[PDB]
Design a protein around this nucleic acid. Structure first.
Ligand code: MG
Ligand code: MG
Ligand code: MG
Ligand code: MG
Ligand code: MG
Ligand code: MG
Ligand code: MG
Ligand code: ZN
Lengths: 201, 97, 80, 196, 129, 152
RNA sequence: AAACUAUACCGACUCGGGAUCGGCUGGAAUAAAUGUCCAGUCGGCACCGUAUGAGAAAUCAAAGUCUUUGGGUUCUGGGGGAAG
């Protein structure tokens, strides 16, 4: 608990990143702290923080950022993740329609060959993960309690339901990646509001 | 109770060696860092994750730990666990603050 | 993270008595104070049939299915 | 105090000391009267324990004749407490235990009872080495080279009594038994269904 | 009805190696099971193992890495004269180059190799590779 | 598992002995006093098992052998009150007879005929044991009429 | 008898999830009970996912732990008809 870390957990809490649906894929058993009277499943936030940083370290690791690929289906993380790709200089799946064959078929128009893949809802984005499975491509996923971890290498426990949550997760990851890349000081605050990544109605 | 796992990595891997002490083995496969299985030519799903090293200034050192995982492990959804623990034993996780 | 050799208490308590490492029982023994004559007696947790305090002959416990029903104002402590 | 021994013929300085102690006690304490009436000793061994502490600690192991055993176990706490006072060392008690050989069966009609067996007897020795307390659990470890290793789980509450004795016990056991013994303290875990 | 405790423990073992499991609880256990494990460990396959004393038979936790391709029991425990060794090493083992067939002998439990060096034989227990 | 029920018989009824072999600390009864009680109960015509239960519920004695060193029957033997026919076999025959009783009257009852077959089967099966282990006279047989007069 | 899961019996071990019938163990609400709910667990009948396990497939959590071939035990088959 530095002031930095306290700011991190405060941001995470405020964004309500720790609220999950009621199903537990048992694969998630380890990431979930509390099970409420109202059935709400509550995530340990420390795990979230840790995993965000780990992820950032995986992304810093790929030499050339365009070999990292963010994939999102839902409407919330469209905005957030396109902004993410924006600051992170990586590739975005914009069209919510992921074309079967995108990773597998060298003949497709959307054809990509990332070194690392990042998905917003393993459950929604599943086809992407399945394709990554055919290519030897590792995956960082944003993961709710209901989400399958099959073929997922880095789990960041989140609430991938809300805009607030998803957006500030992609945000925090981006900021930490910036830091690791020396595009930003470790001590310095980032002038980009989280509010950008929110999905406007 | 870690002892066997450590001793396992203690000495280097060797392909077939005849009495003239040549290496006969065409290539030395990577083995998974969790299950310790062999990494196929043909493995569709085997994966090598590189993770960056961090100086106290937040700086990447350009230094990388590579963690290899094998098809059966990712597929069973053990990956998200395996990796974490592999990072423990290498002293890189959890992340300090 | 899990170690078979150092299993977690709250877990073993949840497990069936034969499925624990030490294979330990769920029963206790209790000192029971008769409501009337105020005598102290020892009673097995799942005790079979019925118990009458030796002094005043009044009824302390009733048998069931693994529970004993402590009747009325009889106070008890587990022995351990 | 040759009355306190079964031979009575010869006693070492150490055995003179213990004998005179038990005399002093059968005289002082009405508590122990009966108990010291019934206790006869076979043997007494002395040990020197030297550790990294630089503390060289004298420790005494006294062997109660088997028929005094029940009474000994009954009097154990009081007894070790007073004897640790009467000499500047620490004390232990065991039962004098014969061991019958595996393959030399002496008489056609005698079946060597398991009560006297290398193992069972050595184990019993451990049980005596801890004597005021008891094992909560016991586990054996196989190292990679093939050395066997013992480690023993002990009641939390008895820490007071057993803390310093540990080294002495491992020295004694390594000596007589040839065994490496380790200890742990856990809480004794009772599984109760309590009704709040 | 339990026959052959070595068989229980061996199969449960192989199963857990095969499932990529990091350790095995093994119950119940015998001398023979522990000597067999002391053998596999000495020979490099399993790692460190711990024995648990429940007042009855026992339990045994086994750290495995993964090495064991298979480890079996042969039942019935046949009679294996020195003459028959060839048979059993060709029939049971993956290759000449490795793997062991363990036997009980009047000189004790041995790698078939230990038996050529001790010049004896005769009761087959199991194998591992 | 459960004997002579093929298909589904298989389940675990409880008893699990604790680890501590030493008798419990709160227990103040001398092993002698215990042997006295157990023998009193015995002479009152109780079963080694029933005696066990009584000592356990009422008297705060969890395991009698961990107190004395002698199991209950052995105590009974030394101290001379002995249950001539083993409690074990005794109950099996009591049963086989109650089935005889009910069956002589309702002769159309097939389930009870089959149950009888099973119980008698177990009785012989126990006889062999107690015979080879010298706990029963060597010529002793279970017949309807013989065993009916046999102390049951 | 298609006396049918067309699937021998005893025993281990290998995935996940709710629900169900019978015991038990705590906990909670009320209108305070042979009733509710919650969490355990033992045993039943099953089901739904899933297997980098099996199979010629249909399919199978056994029909898996089989050429990496051996836990114990009875029974049955060896192209089609002739022919029960
Ligand atoms: Mg045998
Ligand atoms: Mg059973
Ligand atoms: Mg209740
Ligand atoms: Mg077949
Ligand atoms: Mg297939
Ligand atoms: Mg199915
Ligand atoms: Mg076969
Ligand atoms: Zn009363």
């Amino acid at each position: 608990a530095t002031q930095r870390k306290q700011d991190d957990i405060k941001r995470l809490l405020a964004s309500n990143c720790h609220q999950a649906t009621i199903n537990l894929n048992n694969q998630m058993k380890r990431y979930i702290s509390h099970k409420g009277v109202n059935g709400i499943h509550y995530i340990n936030i420390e795990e979230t923080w840790q995993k965000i940083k780990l992820a950032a370290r995986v992304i810093a690791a790929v030499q050339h950022p365009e070999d990292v690929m963010v994939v999102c289906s839902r409407i919330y993380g469209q905005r957030a993740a396109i902004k993410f790709a924006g600051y992170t200089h990586c590739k975005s799946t914009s069209s919510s329609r992921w074309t079967p064959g995108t990773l597998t078929n060298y003949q497709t128009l959307k054809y990509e060959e990332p070194r690392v893949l990042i998905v917003t809802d393993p459950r929604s984005d599943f086809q992407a993960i399945k394709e990554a499975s055919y290519v030897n491509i590792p995956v960082i996923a944003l993961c709710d309690s209901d989400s399958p971890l099959a073929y997922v290498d880095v789990v960041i426990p989140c609430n991938n339901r809300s805009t607030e949550s998803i957006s500030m997760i992609y945000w925090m990851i981006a900021r930490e990646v910036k830091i690791l890349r020396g595009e930003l000081s470790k001590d310095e605050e980032w002038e980009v509001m989280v509010d950008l990544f929110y999905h406007k109605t | 109770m870690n002892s066997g796992r450590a001793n396992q990595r203690s000495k280097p891997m060797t392909g077939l060696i005849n009495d003239k002490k040549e290496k006969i083995d065409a290539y030395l496969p990577r083995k998974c860092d969790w299950s310790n299985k062999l990494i196929f030519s043909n493995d569709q799903s085997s994966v090598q994750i590189a993770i960056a090293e961090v100086g106290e200034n937040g700086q990447a050192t350009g230094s990388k730990t590579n963690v290899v995982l094998c098809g059966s492990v990712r597929s069973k959804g053990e990956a998200h666990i395996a990796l974490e623990n592999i990072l423990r034993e290498r002293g890189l996780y959890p992340i300090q603050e | 993270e899990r170690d078979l050799l150092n299993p977690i208490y709250e877990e073993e308590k949840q497990k069936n008595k034969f499925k624990r490492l030490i294979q330990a029982p769920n029963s206790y023994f209790m000192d029971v104070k008769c409501a009337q004559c105020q005598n102290i007696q020892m009673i097995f947790s799942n005790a079979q049939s019925t118990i009458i305090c030796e002094k005043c002959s009044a009824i302390l416990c009733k048998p069931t299915g693994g529970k004993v029903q402590i009747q009325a104002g009889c106070a008890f402590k587990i022995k351990n | 105090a040759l009355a306190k021994f079964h031979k009575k013929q010869s006693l070492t300085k150490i055995e003179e000391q213990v004998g005179s102690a038990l005399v002093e006690l059968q005289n002082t304490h009405p508590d122990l009267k009966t108990s010291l009436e019934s206790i006869i000793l076979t043997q007494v061994k002395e040990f020197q324990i030297n550790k990294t502490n630089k503390k060289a600690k004298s420790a005494v192991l006294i062997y109660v004749h088997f028929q005094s055993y029940r009474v000994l176990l009954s009097a154990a706490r009081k007894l070790i407490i007073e004897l640790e006072k009467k000499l500047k060392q620490i004390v232990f008690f065991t039962a004098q235990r014969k061991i019958e050989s595996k393959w030399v069966k002496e008489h056609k009609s005698q079946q060597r009872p398991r009560s006297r067996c290398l193992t069972y007897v050595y184990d019993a020795l451990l049980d005596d080495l801890l004597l005021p307390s008891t094992l909560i659990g016991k586990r054996i470890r196989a190292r990679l080279d093939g050395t066997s290793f013992y480690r023993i789980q002990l009641d939390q509450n008895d820490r007071d009594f057993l803390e310093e004795k540990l080294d002495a016990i491992t020295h004694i056991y390594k000596t007589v038994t040839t065994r490496e013994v380790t200890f742990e303290f856990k809480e004794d875990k009772t599984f109760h269904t309590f009704k709040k | 009805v339990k026959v052959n405790i070595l068989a229980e423990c061996l199969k449960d073992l192989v199963n857990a190696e095969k499932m990529g499991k990091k350790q095995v609880l093994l119950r119940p256990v015998s001398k023979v099971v522990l000597k067999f494990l002391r053998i596999m460990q000495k020979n490099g396959y399993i790692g460190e193992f711990e024995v648990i004393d429940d007042h009855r038979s026992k339990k045994v936790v086994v750290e495995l890495i993964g090495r064991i391709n298979k480890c079996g029991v042969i039942s019935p425990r046949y009679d294996v004269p020195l003459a028959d060794f060839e048979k059993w090493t060709n029939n049971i083992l993956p290759s000449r180059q490795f793997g062991n067939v363990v036997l009980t002998t009047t000189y004790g439990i041995l790698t078939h190799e230990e038996c050529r060096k001790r010049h004896t034989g005769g009761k087959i227990l199991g194998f591992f590779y | 598992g459960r004997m002579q029920m093929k298909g589904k018989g298989k389940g675990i009824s409880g008893s699990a002995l604790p680890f501590k072999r030493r008798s419990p600390k709160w227990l103040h009864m001398t092993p002698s006093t215990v042997v006295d009680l157990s023998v009193k109960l015995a002479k009152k015509g109780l079963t080694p098992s029933q005696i066990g239960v009584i000592l356990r519920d009422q008297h705060g004695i969890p395991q009698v052998r961990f107190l004395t060193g002698q199991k209950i029957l052995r105590i009974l033997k030394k101290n001379g009150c002995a249950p001539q026919l083993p409690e074990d076999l005794y109950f099996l025959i009591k049963k086989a007879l109650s089935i005889r009783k009910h069956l002589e009257k309702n002769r159309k009852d097939k389930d009870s005929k089959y149950r009888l077959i099973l119980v008698e089967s177990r009785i012989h099966r126990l006889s062999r044991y107690y015979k080879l282990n010298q706990k029963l006279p060597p010529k002793w047989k279970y017949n309807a009429q013989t065993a009916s007069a046999l102390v049951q």
